[PDB]
Amino acid sequence: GAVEQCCTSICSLYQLENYCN
Amino acid sequence: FVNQHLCGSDLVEALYLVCGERGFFYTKPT
């Protein structure tokens, strides 16, 4: 899955958009 | 960009703020 990957620093809201549908 | 800690709960609310209107994939039913 994709849970523990940002709450321990800061990823890139961009790749975050790739977490959508 | 600005963001402080993102995990499931915070990654979903931001995901939607991110996804704008597009849905996402966090958990599946059964």
Curated annotation (Swiss-Prot), chain A:
Disulfide bonds join C6-C11. Transmembrane segments: none annotated. This is Insulin A chain. The gene is INS. The chain holds residues 90 to 110 of 110 of the full protein.
